[PDB]
Amino acid sequence: SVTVRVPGKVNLYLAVGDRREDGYHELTTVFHAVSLVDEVTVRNADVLSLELVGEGADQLPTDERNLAWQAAELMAEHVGRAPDVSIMIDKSIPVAGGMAGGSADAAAVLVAMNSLWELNVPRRDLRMLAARLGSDVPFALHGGTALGTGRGEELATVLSRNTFHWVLAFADSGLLTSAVYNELDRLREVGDPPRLGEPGPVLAALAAGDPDQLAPLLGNEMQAAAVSLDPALARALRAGVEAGALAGIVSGSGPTCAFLCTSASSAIDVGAQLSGAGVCRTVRVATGPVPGARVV
Numbered sequence: 001s002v003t004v005r006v007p008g009k010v011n012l013y014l015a016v017g018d019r020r021e022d023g024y025h026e027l028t029t030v031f032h033a034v035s036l037v038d039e040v041t042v043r044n045a046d047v048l049s050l051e052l053v054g055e056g057a058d059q060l061p062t063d064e065r066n067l068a069w070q071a072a073e074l075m076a077e078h079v080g081r082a083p084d085v086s087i088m089i090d091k092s093i094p095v096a097g098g099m100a101g102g103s104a105d106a107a108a109v110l111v112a113m114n115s116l117w118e119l120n121v122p123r124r125d126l127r128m129l130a131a132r133l134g135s136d137v138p139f140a141l142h143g144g145t146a147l148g149t150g151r152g153e154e155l156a157t158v159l160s161r162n163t164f165h166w167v168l169a170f171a172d173s174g175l176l177t178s179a180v181y182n183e184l185d186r187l188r189e190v191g192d193p194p195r196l197g198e199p200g201p202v203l204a205a206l207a208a209g210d211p212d213q214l215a216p217l218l219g220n221e222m223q224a225a226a227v228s229l230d231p232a233l234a235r236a237l238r239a240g241v242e243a244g245a246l247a248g249i250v251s252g253s254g255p256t257c258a259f260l261c262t263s264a265s266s267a268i269d270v271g272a273q274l275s276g277a278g279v280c281r282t283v284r285v286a287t288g289p290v291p292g293a294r295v296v
């Protein structure tokens, strides 16, 4: 038996290219792994099986619709083997919370099988499988913080002088990424929504470990479009700041709102205030960066 710990992610920066076709938007993102994690335990078995435990885990498929299952099938096929493993996932990355928990579990399956079967295929081969699986699996292997420029290309590692302290808050209902991109396209036709800074300043603030410098540079071009559809998000972001956060953004298409705090103490206090105030379904504290999928 091998257990791998793998983190969920938040996007600190997301610039979304103008629609082209067939209706694509080129994404430039700064990905940041944070300490809400799943732990995936893989053992040899007679047949592939998958079980998940933890809040929300009962909502998830336990067959080939689950990326972790597809990961086990791909890793085994890659080494000409049958995927004869049992997979147990202790899920603590909030479900449907926009932090790419199925992608983290898939990355963890790759790493757990690599270690369990004593194969030790190189990291390059794992990144290759992760790309086949889906667009967030590569970052779950990578972990830390990284800048991503587009579909294939390597992620670029960004090191920080100190850890950052987050409050992460999850709305009781997610939005379809489809709809948010539509409202983004429309807001741009009808007007001029926020267009982001360049990502170099964001990387410099991260490198410096300076949350006061990072805070006004967090951004997400999808946020306006989310907030257009669910205006409640606007009051939630304001509430988090009223609670003492430096800044808050929506991550991705939501439902994660991410609030950068000055310290672990501050995040505890901001988190308490936000939980008390009921603007969100779930409120959690976290630190980042943390490592990607690794055997524990």
Ligand SMILES: Nc1ncnc2c1ncn2[C@@H]1O[C@H](COP(=O)(O)OP(=O)(O)NP(=O)(O)O)[C@@H](O)[C@H]1O
Pocket (backbone or CB within 6 Å): 060, 061, 065, 066, 067, 068, 089, 093, 094, 095, 096, 097, 098, 099, 100, 101, 102, 103, 105, 106, 136, 252
């Ligand atoms: N172990 C898993 N494998 C694959 N899909 C999953 C898994 N868990 C949840 N999902 C699916 O993805 C949605 C729930 O999200 P989850 O994977 O919990 O983080 P997320 O909300 O997907 N973040 P993102 O990848 O950024 O969209 C639902 O439609 C689920 O069916």
